[PDB]
């Protein structure tokens, strides 16, 4: 039995996650292709060189969870679909986390986050597929433990890739 600690697709894009730096990088996007809109956190600064754009979730109360499962659903555009694709664009992004006994609010310190894993797509989407309304969506999942403190944050680093985060899900079994 899965106990959901945080689910992005569940909220109607209302979680208002923290993005760094303020003004650039990750953004909250919306797609209307049906009665039910699809919400996401997208970023695509492919040709500005080296990027360091962070996206941090809210405070997640760990509860009685020993270890947790992190499930991500995302899309990544093939760099070969951009002028001088490589060097400009990358095809991965980094997933971070950091435990916290209390809600830190808007306080964000990048040096307090530990790298979980570099997230890579099983399928990249190419212009021919993208100029059509078809996307190849990747599913990746990680576990992490043992967590000690009362809660934890999640972070998403960008290095200059066209990535669309459509769903995050953290939970624990029973």
């Amino acid at each position: 039995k899965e106990v959901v600690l945080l689910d992005f697709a569940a909220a109607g894009g209302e979680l208002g996650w923290l993005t760094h730096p303020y003004g650039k990088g990750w953004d909250l996007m919306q797609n209307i292709m049906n009665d039910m809109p699809i919400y996401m956190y997208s970023v695509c600064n492919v040709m500005s060189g080296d990027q360091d754009n962070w996206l941090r979730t809210n405070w997640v109360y760990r509860g009685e969870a020993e270890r947790i499962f992190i499930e991500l659903k995302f899309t990544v555009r093939d760099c070969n679909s951009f002028p001088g694709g490589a060097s400009s664009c990358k095809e991965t992004f980094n997933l971070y986390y950091a435990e916290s006994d209390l809600d830190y609010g808007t306080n964000f310190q990048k040096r307090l986050f530990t790298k979980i894993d570099t997230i890579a797509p099983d399928e990249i989407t190419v212009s021919s597929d993208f100029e059509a309304r078809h996307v190849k969506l990747n599913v990746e999942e990680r576990s992490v433990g043992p967590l000690t403190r009362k809660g934890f944050y999640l972070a998403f680093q960008d290095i200059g890739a066209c990535v669309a985060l459509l769903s995050v899900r953290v939970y624990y079994k029973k």
Partner: peptide, 6 residues
């Protein structure tokens, strides 16, 4: 395949 983190 699957990854765990300390």
């Amino acid at each position: 395949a699957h990854h765990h983190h300390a």
